[PDB]
Amino acid sequence: FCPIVGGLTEAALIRVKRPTGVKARIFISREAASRLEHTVKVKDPAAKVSVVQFELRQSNSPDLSNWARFVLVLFPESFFWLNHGDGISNRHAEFCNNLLDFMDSRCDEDEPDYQTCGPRSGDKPAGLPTWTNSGLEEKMVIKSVLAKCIRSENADMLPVQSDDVFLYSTGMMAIGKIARAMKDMPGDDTAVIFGWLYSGTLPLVKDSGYSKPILYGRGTEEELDKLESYLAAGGKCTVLFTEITSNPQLHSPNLVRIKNLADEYGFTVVVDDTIGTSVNLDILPYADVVTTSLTKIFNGACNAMGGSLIVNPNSRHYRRIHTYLQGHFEDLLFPADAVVLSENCIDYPERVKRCSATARAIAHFLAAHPSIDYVNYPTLVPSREEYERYRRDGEGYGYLLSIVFREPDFAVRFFDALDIWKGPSIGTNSSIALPYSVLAHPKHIVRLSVGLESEAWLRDRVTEALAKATP
C-alpha cells in the first residue's frame, strides 16, 4: 500500500481519536473554518462541531512554522462545496502530512482528546522544503506576469503594478476576499450579480454578508435596462459581479455600459477574466477589480492551485479597495503551488493563443455538422460584436465552447463516444468535456475546454464520436 499519497485527514482524525462517527475538512484559514462551523450550526444547533488547530509549534525555521499548520473541522455525519476555495491545497496537505509528527493540536473548547503533542515535536525534520522564503520570489514572478498581461492598449491608462495584484489559494477565495472587502467599507451594501451562474459566486456573495443580491441571470441588455431603471429611480448599488466570456454559453456582457452606469451611480465593478483571458481581451478600462482563477489556463498543467486579485490603479475606488485588501491580507498561497504556477505562467500567453486558434477551428467545424443545432463560441454567439470591442488585435476568441445538438439523446451518445478527458475543470493543457449531468449542481448542452493538441487530433476524436453516435 505504501508509499501512500493523501491521508492527511485520516492521519489527523487518528491523532484526535475520532476515526469514526464524524466527517472532517481541512482549512488553512481559521476564518474559513469558522464559516463551515456556522453553516452547520445554523442548520442544526446543538450539533457537535469542533475546530482543532494543528501547529508545528517550536521551530526556529520561519518557513516551517508559518506553513506547517492547518485547521481540522469535525462535524456530524448528517452534514458550501462551491466553497472549494478555502480547503487545504493538495501540495499543502502532503506537506503537512509529512510534518504531522512535529505538530501539536489545540482546541479552544477543550475536549482533552483534541490536545495532543506530536511524537517528534521540537525535533528537526530530516529535510527542508525545496522552496525558500515562503516562495515570495516565485509569487512575484506570478504577480508581474499577471500585471503585464492585463496592461491595456490604451496608452493613457495607468499600468498595473505587481503590488496591485493579490494572490490567494483559489479563484473562489479571490472572489470571496473582494466581496467581503466591499461589505466592510461604510455605506449601503447591496450587490448585483450579472450574467454569472454555474459558479460559486452567488453562495459566496450571500455568505460574505450580502444577505441577498439582485441576480441578473443572462447578462442581457434588457437586464441592464432593468438595472438602470432601478438606479435612476434612486436604487442603491455598491458592487457588481460579472465574468468576461461567460460560461457555459460564452456570452459577453456590455462592460462599456456597465462602466458607464458605474460612473454615474458610483458602484464597483468586479470582472472575472478566467474564461475570456487577459491575453485575448483588454477589459482593464471597464473593471475596478479583476479576479482570475490561476488553477485554470494560467497554469494549464492542472497540478497547482491559485487565485489572483487585480486592483485597477485607474479606479475611482482603487485607494479604498487596495487599503482594505492590504489591511487584511494574509499569504495563504502555499509556496509549492506558487513554484509551479510561476513556471507554467511563463508561456501562459503562448498557450492561450494556441488553444484559441484550435478552439475557433473546432467550433466552426462543429457548427457545420448537421447533428448540431448551434455552437456557443464568441465568433458565433449573438454577443459576437460585443466580444470585439474588447478583443486585443492579433488575438483570438478563447478556448471554451459548448455544443447544443438537435436531439438530446444524440448529445449523450456523442459525449460517451468522445475519447478525451472528462471532468469539470477548464483551462487544461489537454482537452476536456463536461455534460449537463455535472454543472447542474438547454439541459443537453456539452461544454468543451480545448487544450494544446493539434487541430487534426481534436478533429479526429470529434468525428469518430459523431460517427458512433449517428445510427
Ligand X SMILES: CCOC(=O)CC(C)=O
Residue 6 lies near ligand X (rule: CB under 6 A): no
Figure out which of the listed residues 294, 426, 432, 466 binds ligand X, where binding follows CB under 6 A: 426
Residue 69 near residue 140, CB atoms below 8 Å = no
Q: Is the peptide bond before 349 cis (omega within 30 degrees of 0)?
A: no
Given a second copy, ligand X, none, residue 439, with its beta carbon under 5 to 8 Å by kind, binds ligand X
Residue 101 lies near a second copy (rule: CB under 8 A): yes
Q: Is the peptide bond before 3 cis (omega within 30 degrees of 0)?
A: yes
Residue 6 lies near a second copy (rule: CB under 8 A): yes
Task: Give min distance, CB of 252 to ligand X, in A.
Answer: 17
Residue 289 lies near ligand X (rule: CB under 6 A): no
Of the pair 356, 379, the CB lying nearest a second copy is at 356
Task: Give min distance, CB of 105 to a second copy, in A.
Answer: 13
138 to 177, contacts with ligand X by CB under 6 A?
Answer: 172
Backbone angles phi, psi at 113, to 5 degrees: -70, -15
Figure out which of the listed residues 65, 144, 185, 198 binds ligand X, where binding follows CB under 6 A: 198
Residue 228 near residue 275, CB atoms below 8 Å = no
Residue 122 lies near ligand X (rule: CB under 6 A): no
Residue 369 near residue 387, CB atoms below 8 Å = no
Burial class (CB in 10 A: 0-12, 13-18, 19+), 187: exposed
Buried-state track 386-414, b at ≥16 Cβ within 10 A, e below 16: bbeebbeeebbbbbbbbbbbeeeebbbbb
CA distances from 303 to 5, 14, 89 (A): 14, 28, 10
Figure out which of the listed residues 50, 59, 83, 89 binds a second copy, where binding follows CB under 8 A: 89
Burial class (CB in 10 A: 0-12, 13-18, 19+), 30: middle
Task: Give min distance, CB of 115 to ligand X, in A.
Answer: 34
Element (H, E) at 99: none
Task: Take residue 253 and report the three cell numbers written for it.
Answer: 456582457
Q: How far apart are CA 166 and CA 146, in angstroms?
A: 10
Residue 439 lies near ligand X (rule: CB under 6 A): yes
Given a second copy, ligand X, none, residue 136, with its beta carbon under 5 to 8 Å by kind, binds none
Given ligand X, a second copy, none, residue 198, with its beta carbon under 5 to 8 Å by kind, binds ligand X
293 to 312, contacts with a second copy by CB under 8 A?
Answer: 295-296, 301-305
Of the pair 251, 296, the CB lying nearest a second copy is at 296
Residue 60 lies near a second copy (rule: CB under 8 A): no
Of the pair 180, 447, the CB lying nearest ligand X is at 447
Pairing of strands 400-405, 372-376: antiparallel
Which range, of 29-37, 198-206, 281-289, 341-349, touches ligand X by CB under 6 A?
198-206
Task: Give min distance, CB of 48 to ligand X, in A.
Answer: 30
Task: Give min distance, CB of 398 to ligand X, in A.
Answer: 14
Figure out which of the listed residues 45, 60, 78, 130 binds a second copy, where binding follows CB under 8 A: 130
336 to 395, contacts with a second copy by CB under 8 A?
Answer: 340, 343-344, 346-347
Backbone angles phi, psi at 457, to 5 degrees: -65, -50
Given ligand X, a second copy, none, residue 199, with its beta carbon under 5 to 8 Å by kind, binds ligand X
Site string for ligand X, 244-273 (x = CB under 6 A): ---x--------------------------
Which range, of 10-18, 210-218, 321-329, 360-368, touches a second copy by CB under 8 A?
10-18
Residue 362 near residue 450, CB atoms below 8 Å = yes
Given ligand X, a second copy, none, residue 98, with its beta carbon under 5 to 8 Å by kind, binds a second copy
Element (H, E) at 201: helix 201-207
CA distances from 333 to 67, 138, 184, 341, 405 (A): 10, 11, 23, 11, 41
Q: How far apart are CA 293 and CA 212, in angstroms?
A: 24
376, amino acid identity: N
Q: How far apart are CA 442 and CA 373, in angstroms?
A: 11
Residue 297 lies near ligand X (rule: CB under 6 A): no
Of the pair 120, 369, the CB lying nearest a second copy is at 120
Residue 230 lies near ligand X (rule: CB under 6 A): no
Q: Is 390 left (phi over 0), alpha (psi -120 to 50) or beta?
A: alpha
Q: Which parts of this chain interact with ligand X (CB under 6 A)?
A: 172, 198-200, 247, 424, 426, 439
Which residue ranges make up the site for a second copy (CB under 8 A)?
Answer: 1-6, 10-11, 14, 17-19, 84, 89-91, 94, 97-98, 101, 119-120, 126-127, 130, 295-296, 301-305, 340, 343-344, 346-347, 419-421, 423-425, 428-430, 451-454, 457, 461, 464
